[PDB]
Amino acid sequence: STNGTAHGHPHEIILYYYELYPTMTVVIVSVASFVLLSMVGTAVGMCVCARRRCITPYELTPGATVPFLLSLLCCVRTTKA
Amino acid sequence: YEHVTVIPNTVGVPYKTLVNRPGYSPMVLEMELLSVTLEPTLSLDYITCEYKTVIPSPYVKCCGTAECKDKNLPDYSCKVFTGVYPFMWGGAYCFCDAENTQLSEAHVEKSESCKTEFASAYRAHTASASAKLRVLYQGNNITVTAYANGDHAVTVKDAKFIVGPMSSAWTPFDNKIVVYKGDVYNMDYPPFGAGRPGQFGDIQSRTPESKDVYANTQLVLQRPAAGTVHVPYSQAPSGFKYWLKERGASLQHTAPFGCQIATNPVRAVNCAVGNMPISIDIPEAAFTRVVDAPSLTDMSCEVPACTHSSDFGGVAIIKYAASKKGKCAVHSMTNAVTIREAEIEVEGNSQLQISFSTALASAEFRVQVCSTQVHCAAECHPPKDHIVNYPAS
Amino acid sequence: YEHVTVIPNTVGVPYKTLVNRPGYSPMVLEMELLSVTLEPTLSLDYITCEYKTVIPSPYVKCCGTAECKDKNLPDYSCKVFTGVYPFMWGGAYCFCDAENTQLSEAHVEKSESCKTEFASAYRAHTASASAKLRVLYQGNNITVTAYANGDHAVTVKDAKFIVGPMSSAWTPFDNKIVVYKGDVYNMDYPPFGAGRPGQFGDIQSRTPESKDVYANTQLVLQRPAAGTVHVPYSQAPSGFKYWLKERGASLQHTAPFGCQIATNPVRAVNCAVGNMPISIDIPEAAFTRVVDAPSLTDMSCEVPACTHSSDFGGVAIIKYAASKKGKCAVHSMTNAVTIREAEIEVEGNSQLQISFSTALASAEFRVQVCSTQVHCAAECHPPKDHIVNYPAS
Amino acid sequence: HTTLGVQDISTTAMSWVQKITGGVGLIVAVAALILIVVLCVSFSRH
Amino acid sequence: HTTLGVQDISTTAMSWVQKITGGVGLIVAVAALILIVVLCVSFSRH
Amino acid sequence: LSYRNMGEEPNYQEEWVMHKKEVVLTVPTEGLEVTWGNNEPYKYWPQL
């Protein structure tokens, strides 16, 4: 019984849960959470890398600004006053 | 050619196996379990039945005293009552007014019914396998009934069949069982010589024809009524008669995996659990060399209709180019899809219609016709019913 | 009064127990195991015996051809030989020189001896133990025979006896056994319908009176000699007849713990190993209050003779001063020394002679006569024999 | 019969969703490496 | 019934030998303590 | 009226029906066997 339509999109995807189940969806959700964590970790790493780039030019003296735009959103806003 | 295969211990589901003898054309065998017997090794502890309180005529001693004799009988009870003045039809039985006594003796025996109406207390040790199964050999259904021990061989249509040994080992029976006529109960019965009054085992005997019996019924004699000749007593009612009313449902109704309980001998029939191996020694007289067959080229697979269900809800048309006229075996190389057709006839530039069963909505499966494979693309749809009345793979 | 005691599973050794009911004079009981049989179920798989190669008169077709008919018989063999010219008493049986044929048919059956001379293939499951205990109760030896399960109660002289349950479960038999007349063999015999030619199981039948039989003897017909009427054949000799010569010693001679193997039905007799508990419900009619006893004072122990052996090789004389005439219990308070006397008679200023058994060379032991203890000094000597014919504590 | 552990279909659609996950992981891994590379450049510069 | 684990006899003699062992252990234990005591005296002296 | 599941857990239930009664029984994937008096047991199986 319990019809397991195809889609779509997604929608039906959750309908299958009823078909063969207890479980299934929870594991997928956990996988999605892991993917989100990977995405979040990447972003955190990227921000740290962006700092690594703005480093050197973190002391003082003219020199960007300049490459601060084009400049990965800070860069600037940052150069200024 | 010996063909060894393992199928699950599930009754009512047909399973197909591909027999590939090198140098000879493939063969497809359909096997289905019709019934599965588990007979436990029993050891009779004792038997219980209705008891008989044997009470003889009371010894009324007029103008004197009677004395109790200690007798070696089951639940033997004796008592002498002083100052008795009993009466009969024509008057008083005794001359004296207060100098009379009455000896009231009693004992418990097995009732005459014990040969017919009785419950047996067994101790189940180990069990064995054994069941029958059908198989479509050479386009004909054959019945095979053998013990599932992996030793008992049965020859049907010149083919040797070896069933078992059983993978498990689960049984619906415990280490202690009780059997009454056609009903088996998983009971923790009291041991021999430890039965309680009013309960199951108040009277214990080795066999329905046995000489010596055990009796614990709590039998006590009472003083007779004024001017009355009778043997009044206080005794706990028959434990067997009480149990026959307060036993509930037997294993036949309460056992898991849809177990059917049979008697004489006691065993469990049809029980899903674990797997079972089956060896088939197919004679070389039913084999055909490959060369004697035909090949195939350019193959295309079209699925005009598919409904993913327990039965063959899919239809597939396969186009081919054959070298010569002959029989070719049809088998699905995908474990999710099963084909109804075991073998078909080919000629040259023609087509073939096959029935298939699957569970997946998107089904991409390979069909091996003769010795060449073809890819089938199918987009199966859900069925109208959520619950079905027949099992599937 | 219920008395629970644990004795080792050793036949032929007497063990003494002290029964001390508070407020009542002590009682000494001497128990001794007699035997301990062991019977285990068994499901007959099949029976093997000598086979009979049934060969009828050969069909000699003069000036023509004979044809073999496929018959459903155990080990059925058929062959037609062309160009045969047989001879009889008065000359040639056939007219033609090379146009004659001979049909040689054969099959294997159970011999007439199978009802008498046969070996049974059994499958042993679980075993049921049954015995025999001697008890010196009230100065008289009583025989008690009951199941060692700790449930089967036997009443002898108004005393309830409960034997077991067994501490351990060892049997000399395996899961597969073979029985021939009075000899039992632990054999891993071939399963039913899987026997090999020349080996044990070349001919397999359900019972000695059974209708259908299994036969694998490797029977092949040969061409007859020049001008001779006979059915020559090549067949592997009787596996049962070969086994009867090459079987070796049975379980009766090879089994450990000195097991004696009996038949009809098969079972192991006499076997030591593990301990066993015994519950004795002694009636209150065999007990005597203490206030009805005497005492003692000043007692010296002298050992004029001692030889440390399995039997009572020691003699001890104990001097005493008793208050009154009565019976007093004698028991050794040392676990290394054992006294033969359970109870003796005392009066006043007198002595008593007791027999004792010990293993130690230097034996310092306390003897409890009635309720007072006495120290015994003994210097026992070694015996003449190193090996004895009876067991000891 | 039937009854078993996936995964299975339904192809396409299935790929549509799968493709969405893991790409961002690759991105942040690459970015991490690039940040390390720049860090080494600074180390060399000193 | 014999068949047990000792030890058992033979008194006196047995004591003669036993008394020889362990006394020296006590001596070296006492000497160790005395050395510690003197060490503490030196520590106090400093 | 008696009923049991045709799987691992049978869960036997028994009741003496005397008056007009309406009974709702859950049918699992393994199957449900219902015995109504002296009649042969009725077998039921849910469809996908």
Author numbering:
A (entry chain Q): 843 to 923
B (entry chain A): 1 to 393
C (entry chain B): 1001 to 1393
D (entry chain E): 394 to 439
E (entry chain F): 1394 to 1439
F (entry chain M): 795 to 842
Text taken from the publication that reported this structure:
Here, we report a 5.3 Å three-dimensional high-resolution reconstruction of the CHIK VLP. Further inspection of the E1 and E2 molecules showed β-barrel structures surrounding empty cavities, thus yielding a good indication of the positions of each domain. The crystal structure of CHIKV E1-E2 was fitted into the 5.3 Å cryoEM map using the program EMfit to maximize the average value of the density (sumf) at all atomic positions, to minimize the steric clash between symmetry related structures, and to minimize the percentage of atoms in low density. Within the CHIK VLP structure, the four quasi-equivalent chymotrypsin-like nucleocapsid proteins were organized as pentamers around the 5-fold vertices and hexamers around the 2-fold icosahedral symmetry axes. The glycoproteins and the nuclear capsid were separated by a ∼45 Å-wide lipid membrane. Thus, the i3 trimers in the VLPs were more compact with a greater number of interactions between its component molecules than the q3 trimer.
Chikungunya virus (CHIKV) is a mosquito-transmitted viral pathogen that causes fever, myalgia, rash, and severe arthritis in humans. The E1 glycoprotein participates in cell fusion, whereas the E2 glycoprotein binds to cellular receptors and initiates clathrin-dependent endocytosis. Most neutralizing antibodies bind to E2, as this glycoprotein is more exposed on the viral surface than E1.
